[PDB]
């Protein structure tokens, strides 16, 4: 699961940059 | 009768004639920019027209929402569901 959340972090940072989540 | 205007007057007469000519040329250029016959008449170029304007920009607009605005709408929907869950939890507590 850590590898999961690591691999998708680029999406996470995109969504955070525009959604201020 | 041959009209004996002043030689300076005659020169300025030819000058107004020249001005009329290149004014017509400018009018033709502006029309060509405004022609709607792009590729309808014998031609292969395009003119500033709905082919380049809102009929072309709304073409971009109806699809651009998929990448730009719908993406933000997704996280906004998440945040809405989250505050809904929060107020439901508060109602359960209260």
């Amino acid at each position: 699961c850590e590898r999961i959340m690591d691999s998708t972090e680029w999406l996470g940072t995109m969504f955070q940059e525009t959604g201020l989540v | 009768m041959e009209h004996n205007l002043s030689p300076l007057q005659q020169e300025v007469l030819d000058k107004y004639k020249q001005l009329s000519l290149d004014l017509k040329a400018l009018d033709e250029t502006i029309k060509e920019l405004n022609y709607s016959q792009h590729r309808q008449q014998h031609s292969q170029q395009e003119t500033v027209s709905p082919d380049e304007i809102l009929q072309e920009m709304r073409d971009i607009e109806v699809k651009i929402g998929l990448v730009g605005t719908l993406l933000k709408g997704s996280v906004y929907s998440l945040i809405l569901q989250r505050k809904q869950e929060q107020e439901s939890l508060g109602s359960n507590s209260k």
Partner: protein, 68 residues
Amino acid sequence: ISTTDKYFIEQRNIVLQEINETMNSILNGLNGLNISLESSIAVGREFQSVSDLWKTLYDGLESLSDEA
């Protein structure tokens, strides 16, 4: 006013009338054209936001200027 002068006046006035109507046509056409460009600007103004907020994939030269 001499007959030569008088004829020059009436010819001059006729071509002023022609210039006036042709300038009116040019003004109306340019008004419409610039209004079309204003409409294009209005519809395109919404693209700046998506461009800047999507930059985070890859910008290249802008990233190089940030890194220079």
